[PDB]
Design a protein around this ligand. Structure first.
Ligand code: HLN
Ligand code: HLN
Ligand code: ZN
Ligand code: ZN
Ligand code: ZN
Lengths: 318, 326
C-alpha cells in the first residue's frame, strides 16, 4: 500500500478496476463554480447530471475515473466527493496547473509551486482532507518559461511522493518531446509520466519513440473527433501501438465533462449531442471497435485495468 | 436602497459609515487561492489576525468603514471579510466587478452574462454567503481592451439597475480615466456614480480637474505607496507630493469630488513573494496612514477640519449611497 488516494479516501490498487485516466467532472476556473453556479443551471443540476453520467459509465464497466481538473480548471473536490459517493465510482483528484494559472500562481517560484503541489498530495486539497493522487501539467507550443517551472515542480512533487504526472500537450506540435526533456532532467522516470492528448496526431513515429522511452501514451480524447478525422482513425492508433508491442504504455480515456465554463456558452450542448455516450464512449464504442479489429480481451483488460493500476500506484519507480 | 448600504455584516444606514477609506484590500490574491493555499499567508488564521490588528489600529485612529475593492479575480473571500469586520468592529463594503486577472470562465462571457454575474452579487449575494456587494470595481489597462470594455458596459448596466456605484483602477500616467468615462457615459451612467481610482499616481492637474468638473469622483487612493534610484537617477516621488493633490483639488473648488484612501492590504499573493514585508516596513501605519499622517499634514497646510471631514465622511457617504432607481 501502494494505495491510491481518491476523493473518498485510499483504495487498494485491486479496487481501481476499469479506470479512465483523463476525465473531468467540470471544466471551469478557480472559484467560479462557487461564485456563479447558475451558469450551470445550478450546482444541484450539475451534480445530478454528473451522477447520472458516472452511473452510466459504471454500468458500462468503469470503476474509477481520474479527474485531471487542476486548481485553475476550477476543480471542486467537494463536488467530486459528492458525485463519487452517489455514483459509487472512484474519483482520483489532481493537483498541478493547467493553461489558465492566475497571477497568484504565475508569479511563484519553482520551490513555491512544489510546496503547493506537495500540500495537495500529502496534506489535502483546501480544508477537505482529500488528497490528490495525480499531478496534471499543461504546456503549449515550445514550453513557456512558466510552464517549465510547473513541469519541474511536478517532477519534484512526484519524486517525493511517487504520485504520477500526466500532461496536456499539443500533439500536432509534438509537444511531449520538450516535456520529456525537462522531466528527465529532473530525474523523473518516464514510467511515472503520461503524455496526454497524444491521439490528436497521425504521426505514429512520435508516439512510438515516446513509448519506447517508457512514457505512457495518453490516447485520451477519442470522442472529440466524433464532434476529417474519424474517431475510428484515432482509435486505430491504439491498435498501432499494440501491434508495435507497446500495449503496456497505452492509457485511453474520453476527456469528457459534465459542465464547462472555460469556453463559449452552450458548447456543452454541442459536445453532448456529438457524443451522447459521454464517458461511456470508451467502453461502449472504442472497446468493441478494437475487438472487431482482432484485439483480444486480455490485451484490452491490460490497457483499461492493468496499465492504470501500475500508473496510479505510487512508486519509486520502474 | 435610499439611505442603506450593503456591508459584509448586512445593511447599515448612511450615518453609520463615518470615516471611510474607499479603496482598500484585506488580501490581494486570486480566485480560489486563499482557500487552496492558506499557508502562503502563514495561515488563514494568521492572515485574519493580522487584518484584525490592522483594522483595530485604523479604528483607534478614527476609521469606521473600509471599502474592500477586491473582485472575484483578486481573490475576494467575503467570509474572510466578514470575520475580520466583526472582530475589528469596522464596517467593510464588498465589491463585485472584475479586475485585471479574469480567468477563462470570465474572459469568454458576453456583456449580458457579465451583467447578470454583477447583478447576482449585488442583488442576491456573493457565493453562498448572502453578503451583497455595495460597489462595482472595474480595471482597465491604459488603452481599454475589448474585454475590459465589455466589463465597463456590464458595470454600468448593473449600476443603473441597482444604484450602486462604480470604482475603477486606472493607469493615471496614461489618463486612463478618460477612456473609461467615455464608455461609461455611452451607457447612460452618471459620472456621480463613478470614482476614477489611482488618480494620485499623476501630477497632471488638468486631467484631474476636468474629470472632477464632469462630476466624477477622484480617487486619491494610494498615498502611502510612495513611502516604499533607477539608472537615469530618477528618484521616487514623495507621499506629501501625492497628498498635496488633495489640497490642489480643494483650491480649484472640487472638494466634493475627492475620495482618499491607502490602497493597503494585509496579505498579497498577486505579486512576487515578500512584497508584503517591504510594504509593511515602508508604511508601518497600514490603513492608519491616512488618519495619522495625511490628515495632520493637510491641517498643517491650512485646510479646515470641516473640509477634511467632508472629504473623509460626507463624500464617501454620498458616493456609496445607492442612488437612482425608484
Ligand atoms: C478550454 C476547454 C475547457 C476544458 C479543457 C480541458 P482539456 O485541456 O483536457 O481539453 C479540452 C476539453 C474540452 C474542449 C471542448 C471544446 C474545445 C476544446 C476542448 C479541449
Ligand atoms: C498587483 C497586486 C496588488 C493587488 C492589486 C491592488 P491595486 O491594483 O488596487 O493597487 C495596488 C496596491 C498595492 C500594490 C502593491 C505592490 C504593487 C502594486 C500594488 C498595486
Ligand atoms: Zn488538456
Ligand atoms: Zn482534460
Ligand atoms: Zn488598482
Amino acid at each position: 500500500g501502494d494505495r491510491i488516494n481518491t476523493v473518498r479516501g485510499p483504495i487498494t490498487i485491486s479496487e481501481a478496476g476499469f479506470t479512465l485516466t483523463h476525465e473531468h467532472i467540470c471544466g471551469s476556473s478557480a472559484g467560479f463554480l462557487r461564485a456563479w453556479p447558475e451558469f450551470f443551471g445550478s450546482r444541484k443540476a450539475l451534480a445530478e447530471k454528473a451522477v447520472r453520467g458516472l452511473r452510466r459509465a459504471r454500468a458500462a464497466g468503469v470503476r474509477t475515473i481520474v479527474d485531471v481538473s487542476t486548481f485553475d480548471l476550477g476543480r471542486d473536490v467537494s463536488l467530486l466527493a459528492e458525485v463519487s459517493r452517489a455514483a459509487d465510482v472512484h474519483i482520483v483528484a489532481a493537483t498541478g496547473l493547467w493553461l489558465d494559472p492566475p497571477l497568484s500562481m504565475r508569479l511563484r517560484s519553482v520551490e513555491e509551486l512544489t510546496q503547493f503541489f506537495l500540500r495537495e498530495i500529502q496534506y489535502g486539497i483546501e480544508d477537505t482532507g482529500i488528497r490528490a493522487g495525480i499531478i496534471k501539467v499543461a504546456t503549449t507550443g515550445k514550453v513557456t518559461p512558466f510552464q517549465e517551472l510547473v513541469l519541474r515542480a511536478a517532477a519534484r512533487a512526484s519524486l517525493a511522493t511517487g504520485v504520477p504526472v500526466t500532461t496536456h500537450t499539443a500533439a500536432s506540435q509534438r509537444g511531449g518531446e520538450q516535456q520529456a526533456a525537462i522531466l528527465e532532467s529532473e530525474g523523473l522516470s518516464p514510467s511515472r509520466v503520461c503524455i496526454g492528448h497524444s491521439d490528436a496526431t497521425d504521426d505514429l513515429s512520435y508516439l512510438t519513440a515516446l513509448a519506447a522511452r517508457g512514457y505512457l501514451i495518453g490516447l485520451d480524447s477519442i470522442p472529440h473527433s466524433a464532434i476529417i478525422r474519424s474517431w475510428q482513425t484515432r482509435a486505430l492508433l491504439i491498435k498501432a501501438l499494440i501491434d508495435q508491442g507497446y500495449t503496456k504504455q497505452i492509457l485511453v480515456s474520453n476527456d469528457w465533462l459534465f459542465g464547462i465554463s472555460s469556453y463559449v456558452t452552450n458548447i456543452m450542448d454541442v459536445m453532448d449531442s456529438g457524443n451522447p455516450d459521454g464517458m461511456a464512449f470508451i467502453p461502449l464504442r472504442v472497446i468493441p471497435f478494437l475487438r472487431e479489429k482482432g484485439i483480444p480481451q486480455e490485451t484490452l483488460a491490460g490497457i483499461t485495468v492493468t496499465n492504470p493500476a501500475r500508473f496510479l500506484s505510487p512508486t519509486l519507480r520502474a
